[PDB]
Design a binder for this molecule. Structure first.
Ligand code: CL
Ligand code: CL
Ligand code: CL
Lengths: 133, 134
């Protein structure tokens, strides 16, 4: 079964391929990236595309105190037959504002690097808080 | 990389372990289990627990026209060190009403089978629609 990505206590623990995107995010996010005990995890950003490799680096990059990305997952088949897999990554946050910021953080990264894929995305809102405390 | 659950054209195509739960969901959901082109995929139910095998059965059980579950995924480690894994499964719906019905569909199953694990769940709302059309 799938395992959650290994959390980084420091910068050097992140894989080399996802490191520059990670560094970009740590600086981009700033304070928002830090952990807030007062806020509940009821918000997330869903990223989806056809390339799991790119979503993997996004997943590996988004490992912070206030931003934690789940592993690479996928959406169910849209049709009655198996289709080309649409992969996806849920990037969980503590507040709605951080979710919007993460969404743009990717947009900033995509505009900076044309090699990166044009990921589709959406803000996610949960009714109950998730066990990430 | 992870793969999405297989879609069924008929009940006999559903995996054997998930068949008893699938047939129950097909009846309970009834008309709500069917697909609506007019509706957009902006809603979901996230189930989570410690047992991936139960969630895998749930995942395989929920495969309908208007209700489709993703594979067995998981939530990230809460702390800097590794802790016992919290597995999860998103069940995608077309409306909030159906998502509530799916949520209680499992609760009905849990009430129907005390052997089944007690899965924590929450309704999900997406700002932008998801590509599960046509
Ligand atoms: Cl990329
Ligand atoms: Cl959005
Ligand atoms: Cl809920």
């Amino acid at each position: 079964y799938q395992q959650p990505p290994v959390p980084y206590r420091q910068i050097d623990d992140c894989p080399a391929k996802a490191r520059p995107q990670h560094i970009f995010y740590r600086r981009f996010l700033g304070k928002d990236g830090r952990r807030d005990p007062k806020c509940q995890w009821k918000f997330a950003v869903i990223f989806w595309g056809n390339d799991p490799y790119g979503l993997k680096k996004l997943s590996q990059a988004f490992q912070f105190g206030g931003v934690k990305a789940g592993p690479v997952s996928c959406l169910p088949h849209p049709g009655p037959d198996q289709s080309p897999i649409t992969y996806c990554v849920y990037v969980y946050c503590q507040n709605k504002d951080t979710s919007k910021k993460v969404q743009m953080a990717r947009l900033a990264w995509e505009a900076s690097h044309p090699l990166a894929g044009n990921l589709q995305s959406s803000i996610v809102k949960f009714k109950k808080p998730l066990p990430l405390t």
